[PDB]
Design a protein around this ligand. Structure first.
Ligand code: MG
Ligand code: ZN
Ligand code: ZN
Ligand code: ZN
Lengths: 98, 39, 783, 244, 168, 270, 81, 111, 146, 65
RNA sequence: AUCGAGAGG
């Protein structure tokens, strides 16, 4: 009953890469870290004018898609504006064994 | 790119006082792990 | 260290690996582009000139082509700059640097190379695409995965080196590791899981499904087995079809907790003559365990047959699983209502207990434990309560999971997963910890700015009440992140530390070898061990066996080993022998029986002195028990008929075997004495295993079967003896260095009777190998 | 890789005709192994999928923001309202036979990221090529047609295997090999090998007769010469005088 | 602590006994304490158990502790490998470490010693002391491309005169 | 299998849909038919693009890729020579269809380039093929790309004959629904459940076409799979009924070809 | 010495490996084969046949720690393994 | 890079006949037939119909590896019933049923 | 077909589907021969059972093919599909299983027990004191009349 | 960057629905879910092709070359 | 050619 301040929103403790993870608090810690590294490795549109600038090694997805499930942080990181991946349909199952 | 712009290279554990100031999850794997932190 | 001890080499390749269940254990899928690139200087002879001239005609643009041709003059003909593909006539003695062909022997490995198993020879299979393809089961020794791992090829150039690899480094030959005295390869991932499901009691297979499964087995003899059920429907059990993969003559009996040879649980394991008889097949049976199928087959049939076993089982099971299916999802992590209520009650109860103690500690009523302070006594007791709570909650969830639960099934099979994984996903994640402690007060008298000062209530110091399913709350999340951080750190540090340690051991023992005198020596010729391993035998041929005479009461021993033809108390039942009525009262045979028994009594005395803890299970060469079973089956030992064995023949037969075991072959008393000592335990095993009653009542063998057993034991024993030239130095160094990489304990997480604040894991290993004068934890045990 | 630190590579690709399918004719784009879950405990990965399906069916954006009041039960309720199994399991058929699979499959939309690192820019193989001028030893680097390093650990294992002739081949025949003449009197590489008149002469020992040829790795030659550079002799003898 | 004790029946029966686990080591005095069984006292110090009892006791204890470390995580390594290690570390009558002050301080071939840690610091000594390297070790033949003794190179395949005749 | 089998019943039908009840057939055939419709029916599609002018945002091959996915009238595809069997060099009107695309940002506003803007140049010889399939109620068949005022695009396309096994671009099936044993009577699947599978699993729409199983019934182990519910779609290049008929024809030809092979060997045998 | 050979009478896996390798090499060098080539063209397979029939014309010099040695012929050695 | 040609999924190559019939040695009246450039889209039909023939003792198939469009078929029959002819009969049977399928669909469609 | 190793009638005292959806553990006792109890795992899904049911249980050993005695086709030689059920065949039972043998456990000499097993489904028959016909030979066809 | 011609998972042409899709959202002001339904996009494996599409080409055309 | 940085395993 002596509170002096209040967090604007718990999720703000996360950084850029961490904030694009779905339900971070339902993963084992190390996995969120691993994703933080993976996010940096993803392909996608970097700069809108990438066609103008000449550079060494650009990796542009043909058809970038929004994350069907997003975090509110993406509103400020403009991830929806410049996403990096696709909404693939997946099946978690043992099949041919490959 | 944003991960560079918010990058803080220390010259290695998640100290309690990091709460809210640097990201708990974001860190390099091995070597500089725990030393390079992101805001 | 840079250019001499290690160096860059030609005739090599590197790329990403991917799994391929349709390859044989000892095969490797090599991309056409690599097969085209790398070459081999095959010599032109009267037995291959036909093929080689065709390869020249094919040119250097085919995955069955060739490149440079070497003349006797030493000239190298570059086929990329030649219009004489069909004009060049090869002469005998020339060489043709052809492309890599199927079944070529190549050396294949993964970095870092921690042990022999990381370097194995495979048979090349030229494939499309651009990854190396591997049989799932070979990744276990490589320590490989398919998340982007890369492997190296080293291609032999001389005929001598091809032979050397194919006869020494071939995968099949590495199935049983000398490191831990067990198999290092086995059935894992999907196949392992699939097998469990396949061999379940309720698994029955339709006719046409069976026809395909049988066809998949490469070694199927074309004989369709009669179905378990013949009337209403011709159905085959999963056990029946799987057993087709297993070779004839194989016997195995594990026998688990509640196994009764009829248990409704279908636990344990019984295999007779290659036929699966009883028990669900799981990790314990077809895993890397040395008490399982993989080991037995390797020993009984050999490396070549066992390699086929891997292929046979995988092809059948993977096919069956393909047409069955196996998945997993969120529902598998969800416990029902009642269960979750009990979980929250368990957590709440523990919290109450922690609170009660907290109050007592605050009230200065809590008494310090011996050997520690009051404050840490409190800390200790609280952690204990919270750990117990986590586990109890986990068990509540576990117990109430249905057999349908896919996660549960993977855990039951033993293919990825464990109790704690279920417990954390479905129930309490548990108390987080940093450096073996609860979350420390990084702020003044508190862990976060969200708590008041001086508050030790479970959750304030890292206790997580929620499951991964339920989700962690901000504070729990952060505390969890802190625990995760130190974990990540340790996984980095330990590779630097164990990498160094491993190298030091290998270098230290680099030149330790078994010489032709059977003595272990270094470069200087200094004797390390007069007899390698204090027995002179190869670890790869050692199996854990039971020394029956060590245990049991003296009375029980007498009942099982004393024979007295002069007194009815221990006289053999006449019906045991064809002449069992003639031996009655035969003092001369009684003398031999007295000799035998006397020795067996001495054996108890001796072994009681050697193994004071009473342990009867020890690693000894030659699984005699299994040998006996082979005789019982091979000769159709009818246990209702009197045998033609003679007591004299049994006693002297066994004694003769002992004399013909050999290890050393010198004539000097020094060597002869060493020989007598070298085989003491094995002889104790022989005597305890092949006693008169054991041979006549328990193992009612015929003279033919009995003689066969003795000659069989001899042959196998000789095979178990270590070969000269063996690099036991490096081998031991790798054997000790490798598994050290699994020590993530550091100082705790091993438990004991006293306050175990004892340095362990890698930290302790370093103290030992460095011979530190100031160890962190001295401790003296006084009795 | 997914958004949950779940990496992987494409083991094999199948045409739609050969892959599992739902009653509705929906065929997976990417099949993930069940064994990749239970040990990693990436529950969020599973949740994202469930939520994503609801989002696709309802035609809106899902909210996976960390610390909210969104629960699995809420999500599953919505899914059941769309006529699908509440926990995301769907009955699928075997693409090969068309027979209904015995186990139902957790199936739905998710989000994967194509990562940098492609086998086409990693695969490497070379048989003879550019060697470093210093040590005459295959150069370093995939892009420069370099060789692969047979490291200390790799030769250690060959020793453990007992592959003595293999090491000789890989350490000398597969790179670094040099014929050098050694003076029998003083085991130094000072012989003037006049390989055209068969004249030798040690000079300093005046040995024009008792010399021998050694097949040795060029790098080892450099070692010995670099020792000579420090006024230290490494006298190589071909006749063991110290019998025992 | 519990311990199996061969009962009067001949069969081992688990019995309990009081054991005093102390913090610190001082065998020189503890062993003489009245009421204590001086033959069962066991420490963690190799140096102290060696100095008090001897190199064989030290070596035996060395094994036991190596064993404990490996066994502490539930893993298993064959006795034969662990025995070899501790035997090598105690061939000199003391405790030889695996460091440059243990392994490198030996009488073995100079071309092998220098491959571990110290390099010219060893080669300079070899030069000044006119050390002769017998070249029958491993590294000695690695560092010059010869078929080192070991495995297929531990013997020499040849046709002698007797067998030549027998092979015709 | 002797003619008195496949009883085809149609529940619903439209230009791009045929809802089937195929009873009295072998499951293997029901599936084989499903599979052959998916990937062994020949269609017409752009398989080569010549880029003359491209000052647009999109990459040359990016556009070429998109063009190959545009569905072309393939009604008379059987009258078009399969390119692999065409002895005529490169290509010709007998085995290919040539289309061109010309666009320029005449307006200052974004100019849209549509598949409707493709123009057939080669001689169709009266064969009903090549015409870009337009099912857009606005007439604007598939958007190829957007175009800025000062930009220009000029392409020449060559469409060929092929099947989905070669590339997904050739498929016409789109999607095929397939289900049998609405009510789990054959026990081909064991429903996963956390309480009551009868309530947890959604009842299939096909269940209304078969009487519910009784709890007093014994497992009818003699029963076989039969009565397959299917719904074949179409991308528009081939009338949905032709997708099915031609799929069936394909299987007949496939079996006939191995039958022929058997005959050929017997002819070559003594 | 000829007699009193203290080393094993069995052929070791290392001896076998090198014997086959060196013999196979000779075969690949177009040396005369002492067994019937029953469709055998692979030097190694050919060598293994000779090993089985003890036709391989080789002697193993087993060096002992002190520099001495024992000569054993292929025919004398017991090719079990 | 080193990806295979998609034409190899259905077009016969050089020296590749459509069928190759080998005789089994593990059992009497049994053969193994190799189908080139042909997966179980067709293969599964063949097995299914073979198992409807009461004179066939064994009928099964397998695709040894998915990288290659090849199909192994094993057929065992009773004495006198040459497995080759058994297959020929299965083909005739399948075609006849397909003919009816087409006819019934076309009629149902028209109506 | 040609012979019988055992022939008696049992009444089911208990049925236990220990976490099984098809197979139940049957505990039955022989009528008349009160020294002979029978334990049996049976595919209930395929062949329905109930407590207190009286079943006729035999073992036999005649390889039940098609013509007069133990024809090899069932044991040793590829098993032939049905069709020949229209020939000499002991198919007048409502359930048939082909099994094997473990060991003739001897219980308290006067008491009785015998070997057993059907591809994973187990049994335990306390067959009469003699069991002389009931040979160790694994060939066995548990025949049950409903 | 323009809408994928054909659904990745089906081959169902959705490259002619984008324009009208936006109209349903703007001119008609419908919920995205109902708009997708109005387009005939029954299967969620096709709905996602439009639902999560990012029209970047409009941004690219803002540059003058 | 060295030198540092970013990563991958
Ligand atoms: Mg990996
Ligand atoms: Zn000189
Ligand atoms: Zn043409
Ligand atoms: Zn779709």
């Amino acid at each position: 009953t002596t509170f002096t301040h209040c967090e604007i929103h718990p999720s703000m403790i996360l950084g850029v890469a961490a904030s694009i993870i779905p339900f971070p608090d339902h993963n084992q810690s190390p996995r969120n870290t691993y994703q933080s590294a993976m996010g940096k490795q993803a392909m996608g549109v970097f700069l809108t004018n990438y066609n103008v600038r000449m550079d060494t090694m650009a990796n542009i997805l043909y058809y970038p898609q929004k994350p069907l499930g997003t975090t509110r942080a993406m509103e400020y990181l403009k991830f929806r504006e410049l996403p990096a991946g696709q909404n693939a349909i997946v099946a978690i199952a043992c099949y041919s064994g490959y | 790119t944003l991960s560079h712009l918010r990058r803080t290279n220390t010259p290695r554990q998640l100290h309690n006082t990091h709460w809210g100031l640097v990201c708990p999850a974001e860190t390099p794997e091995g070597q500089a792990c725990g030393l390079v932190k992101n805001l | 260290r840079g250019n001499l001890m290690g160096k860059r080499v030609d005739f090599s390749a590197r790329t990403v690996i991917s799994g391929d269940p349709n390859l044989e254990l000892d095969q490797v899928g090599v991309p056409k582009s690599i097969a085209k690139t790398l070459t081999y200087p095959e010599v032109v002879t009267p037995y291959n000139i036909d093929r080689l001239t065709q390869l020249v005609r094919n040119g250097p643009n085919e995955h069955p082509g060739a490149k440079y041709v070497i003349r006797d003059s030493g000239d190298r003909i570059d086929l990329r700059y030649s219009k004489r593909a069909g004009d060049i006539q090869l002469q005998y003695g020339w060489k043709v640097e052809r492309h890599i062909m199927d079944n070529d022997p190549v050396l294949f490995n993964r970095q870092p190379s921690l042990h022999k198993m990381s370097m194995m020879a495979h048979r090349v299979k030229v494939i499309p695409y651009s990854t190396f393809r591997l049989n799932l089961s070979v990744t276990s020794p490589y320590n490989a995965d398919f998340d982007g791992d890369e492997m190296n090829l080293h291609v032999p150039q001389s005929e001598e080196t091809r032979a050397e690899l194919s006869q020494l480094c071939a995968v099949p030959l590495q199935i049983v590791s000398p490191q831990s005295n067990k198999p290092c390869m086995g059935i894992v991932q999907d196949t392992l899981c699939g097998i469990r499901k396949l061999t379940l009691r309720d698994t029955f297979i339709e006719l046409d499904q069976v026809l395909n499964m049988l066809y998949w087995v490469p070694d199927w003899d074309g004989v369709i087995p009669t179905p378990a059920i013949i009337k209403p429907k011709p159905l085959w059990s999963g056990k029946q079809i799987l057993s087709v993969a297993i070779p004839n003559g194989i016997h195995l009996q594990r026998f688990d907790e509640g196994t009764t040879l009829l248990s409704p649980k279908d636990n344990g394991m019984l295999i007779i003559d290659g036929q699966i008889i009883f028990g669900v097949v799981e990790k314990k049976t077809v895993g890397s365990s040395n008490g399982g199928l993989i080991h037995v087959v390797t020993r009984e049939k050999g490396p070549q047959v066992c390699a086929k076993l891997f292929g046979n089982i995988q092809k059948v099971v993977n096919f069956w699983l393909l047409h069955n299916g196996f998945s997993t999802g969120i529902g598998d992590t969800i416990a029902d209502g009642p269960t979750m209520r009990e979980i929250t009650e368990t957590i709440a109860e523990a919290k109450k207990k922690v609170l009660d103690v907290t109050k007592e500690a605050q009230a200065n009523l809590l008494t310090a434990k011996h050997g520690m302070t009051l404050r840490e006594s409190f800390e200790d007791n609280v952690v204990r309560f919270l750990n117990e709570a986590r586990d109890k909650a986990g068990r509540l969830a576990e117990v109430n999971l249905k057999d349908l639960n896919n996660v549960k099934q993977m855990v039951m099979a033993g293919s990825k997963g464990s109790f704690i994984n279920i417990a954390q996903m479905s129930a309490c994640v548990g108390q987080q910890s940093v450096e073996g402690k609860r979350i420390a007060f990084g702020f003044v008298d508190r862990t976060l700015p969200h708590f008041s000062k001086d508050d030790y209530s479970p959750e304030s110091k890292g206790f997580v009440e929620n499951s991964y399913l339920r989700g962690l709350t901000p504070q729990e999340f952060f505390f969890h992140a802190m625990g995760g951080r130190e974990g990540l750190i340790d996984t980095a540090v330990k590779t630097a530390e164990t990498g160094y340690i491993q190298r030091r051991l290998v270098k230290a023992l680099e030149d330790i070898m078994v010489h032709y005198d059977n003595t272990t020596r270094n470069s200087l010729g200094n004797v390390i061990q007069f007899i390698y391993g204090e027995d002179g035998m190869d670890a790869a041929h050692i199996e854990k066996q039971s020394l029956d005479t060590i245990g049991g009461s003296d009375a029980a021993f007498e009942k099982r080993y004393r024979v007295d033809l002069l007194n009815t108390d221990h006289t053999l039942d006449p019906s045991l022998l064809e002449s069992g009525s003639e031996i009655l009262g035969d003092l001369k045979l009684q003398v031999l029986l007295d000799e035998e028994y006397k020795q067996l009594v001495k054996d108890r005395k001796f072994l009681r002195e050697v193994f004071v803890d009473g342990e009867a299970n020890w690693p000894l060469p030659v699984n005699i028990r299994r040998i006996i079973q082979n005789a019982q089956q091979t000769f159709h030992i009818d246990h209702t008929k009197p045998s033609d064995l003679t007591i004299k023949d049994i006693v002297l037969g066994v004694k003769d075997l002992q004399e013909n075991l050999l290890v050393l072959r010198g004539k000097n008393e020094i060597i002869q004495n060493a020989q007598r000592d070298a085989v003491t335990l094995f002889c104790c095993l022989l005597r305890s295993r092949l006693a008169t009653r054991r041979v006549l009542q328990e193992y009612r063998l015929t003279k033919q079967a009995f003689d066969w057993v003795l000659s069989n034991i001899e042959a196998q024993f000789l095979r178990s003896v270590v070969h000269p030239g063996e690099m036991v130095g490096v081998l031991a160094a790798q054997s000790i260095g490798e598994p050290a990489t699994q020590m993530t304990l550091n100082t705790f997480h091993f438990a004991g009777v006293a306050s175990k604040k004892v340095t362990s894991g890698v930290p302790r290993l370093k103290e030992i190998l460095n011979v530190a004068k100031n160890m962190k934890t001295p401790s003296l045990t006084v009795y | 890789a997914s958004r949950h630190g779940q990496k992987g590579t494409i083991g094999i690709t199948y045409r739609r005709e050969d892959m599992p399918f739902t009653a509705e004719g929906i065929v997976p784009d990417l099949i993930i192994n069940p064994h990749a879950i239970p040990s990693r405990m990436t529950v969020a990965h599973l949740i994202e999928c469930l939520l994503s399906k609801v989002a696709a069916l309802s035609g809106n954006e899902g909210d996976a923001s960390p610390f909210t009041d969104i629960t699995v039960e809420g999500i599953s309720k919505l899914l059941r309202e769309h006529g699908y199994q509440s926990r995301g399991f769907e009955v699928m058929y075997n693409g090969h036979t068309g027979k209904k699979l015995m186990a139902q499959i957790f199936f739905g939309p998710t989000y994967y990221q194509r990562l940098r690192h492609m086998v086409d820019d990693k695969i490497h193989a070379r048989a003879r090529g550019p060697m470093q001028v210093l040590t005459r030893q295959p150069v370093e680097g995939r892009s420069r047609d370099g060789g692969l390093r047979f490291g200390e650990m790799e030769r250690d294992c060959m020793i453990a295997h007992g592959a003595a002739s293999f090491l000789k081949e890989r350490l000398m025949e597969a790179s670094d090999a040099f014929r050098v003449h050694i003076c029998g009197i003083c085991g130094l590489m000072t012989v003037i090998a006049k390989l055209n008149h068969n004249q030798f002469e040690c000079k300093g020992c005046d040995n024009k007769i008792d010399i021998y040829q050694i097949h040795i790795p060029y790098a080892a030659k450099l070692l010995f010469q670099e020792l000579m550079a420090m006024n230290i002799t490494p006298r190589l003898y071909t006749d063991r005088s110290r019998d025992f | 602590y519990d311990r199996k004790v061969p009962s009067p029946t001949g069969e081992y029966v688990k019995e309990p006994e009081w054991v005093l686990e102390t913090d610190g080591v001082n065998l020189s005095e503890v062993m003489t304490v009245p009421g204590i069984d001086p033959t069962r006292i066991y420490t963690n110090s190799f140096i102290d158990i060696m100095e008090v009892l001897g190199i064989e006791a030290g070596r035996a204890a060395l094994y036991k502790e190596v064993y404990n470390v490996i066994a502490s995580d539930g893993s298993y390594v064959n006795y034969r490998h662990m025995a070899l290690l501790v035997d090598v570390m105690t061939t000199q009558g003391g405790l030889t470490s695996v460091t440059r002050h243990g392994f490198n301080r030996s009488n073995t071939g100079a071309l092998m010693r220098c491959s571990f840690e110290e390099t010219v610091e060893i080669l300079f000594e070899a030069g000044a002391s006119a050390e002769l390297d017998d070249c029958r070790g491993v590294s000695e033949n690695v560092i010059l491309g010869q078929m080192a003794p070991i495995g297929t190179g531990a013997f020499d395949v040849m046709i002698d005169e007797e067998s030549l005749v027998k092979y015709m | 299998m002797s003619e008195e089998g496949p009883q085809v019943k149609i529940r619903e039908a439209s230009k791009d849909n045929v809802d089937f009840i195929l009873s009295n057939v072998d499951l293997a055939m029901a599936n084989s038919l499903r599979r052959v419709m998916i990937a062994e029916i020949p269609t017409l599609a752009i398989d080569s693009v010549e880029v003359e002018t491209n000052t647009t945002v999109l990459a040359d091959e990016f556009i070429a890729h998109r063009l190959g996915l545009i569905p072309l009238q393939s009604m008379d595809i059987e009258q078009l020579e399969y390119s692999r069997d065409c002895f005529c060099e490169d290509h010709c009107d007998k085995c290919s269809v040539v289309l061109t695309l010309q666009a320029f940002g005449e307006s200052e506003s974004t100019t849209n380039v549509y598949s409707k803007d493709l123009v057939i140049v080669s001689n169709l010889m009266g064969r009903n093929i090549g015409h870009p399939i337009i099912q857009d109620k606005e007439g604007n068949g598939v958007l190829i790309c957007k175009l800025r005022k000062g930009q220009e695009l000029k392409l020449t396309c060559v469409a060929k004959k092929g099947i989905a096994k070669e590339h997904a671009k050739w498929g016409p099936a789109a999607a095929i629904e397939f289900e049998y044993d609405p009510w789990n009577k054959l026990k081909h699947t064991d429903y996963w459940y956390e309480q009551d599978s009868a309530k947890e699993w959604p009842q299939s729409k096909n269940c209304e076409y078969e009487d519910p199983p009784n709890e007093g019934d014994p497992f009818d182990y003699k029963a076989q799979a039969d009565t397959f519910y299917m719904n074949v779609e179409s991308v528009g290049s081939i009338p949905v009924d032709q997708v099915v008929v031609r799929g069936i024809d394909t299987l007949q030809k496939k079996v006939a070809s191995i039958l022929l092979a058997l005959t050929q060997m017997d002819q070559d045998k003594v | 010495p000829k007699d009193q050979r203290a080393t094993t009478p069995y052929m070791t896996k290392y001896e076998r490996a090198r014997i086959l390798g060196t013999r196979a090499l000779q075969i690949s060098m177009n040396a005369p084969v002492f067994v019937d080539l029953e469709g055998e063209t692979d030097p190694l397979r050919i060598a293994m046949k000779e090993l089985a029939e003890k036709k391989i014309p080789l002697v193993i010099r087993r060096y002992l720690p002190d520099g001495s040695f024992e000569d054993w012929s292929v025919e004398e050695l017991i090719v079990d393994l | 890079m080193n990806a295979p040609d998609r034409f190899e999924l259905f077009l016969l190559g050089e020296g590749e006949s459509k069928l190759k019939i080998d005789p089994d040695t593990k059992a009497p009246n049994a053969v193994v037939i190799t189908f080139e450039k042909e997966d179980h889209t067709l293969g599964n039909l063949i097995r299914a119909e073979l198992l409807n023939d009461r004179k066939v003792l064994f009928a099964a198939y397998k695709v040894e590896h998915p990288f290659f469009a090849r199909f192994k078929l094993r057929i065992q029959t009773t004495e006198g019933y040459d497995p080759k002819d058994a297959l020929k009969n299965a083909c005739n049977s399948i075609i006849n049923k397909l003919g009816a399928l087409k006819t019934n669909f076309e009629t149902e469609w028209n109506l | 077909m040609s012979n019988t190793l055992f022939d008696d009638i049992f009444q089911v005292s208990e049925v236990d589907p220990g976490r099984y959806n098809k197979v139940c553990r049957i505990e039955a006792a022989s009528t008349t021969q009160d020294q002979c109890k029978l334990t049996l795992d049976i595919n209930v899904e395929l062949f329905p059972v109930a407590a207190q049911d009286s079943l006729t249980v035999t073992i036999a050993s005649s390889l039940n093919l098609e013509d007069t005695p133990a024809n090899d086709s069932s044991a040793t030689r590829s098993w032939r599909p049905p069709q020949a059920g229209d020939r000499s065949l002991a198919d007048d039972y409502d359930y048939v299983m082909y099994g094997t043998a473990y060991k003739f456990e001897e219980v308290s000499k006067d008491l009785i027990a015998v070997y057993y097993s059907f591809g994973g489904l187990l049994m335990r028959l306390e067959g009469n004191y003699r069991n002389l016909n009931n040979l160790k030979q694994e060939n066995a066809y548990l025949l049950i009349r409903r | 960057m323009i809408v994928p011609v054909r659904c990745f998972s089906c081959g169902k042409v959705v490259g002619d629905k984008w324009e009208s899709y936006l109209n349903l959202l703007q001119e008609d002001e419908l919920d995205e879910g109902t708009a997708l339904s109005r387009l005939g996009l029954k299967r969620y494996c096709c709905r996602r092709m439009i639902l999560t599409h990012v029209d970047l080409i409009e941004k690219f055309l803002r540059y003058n070359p």
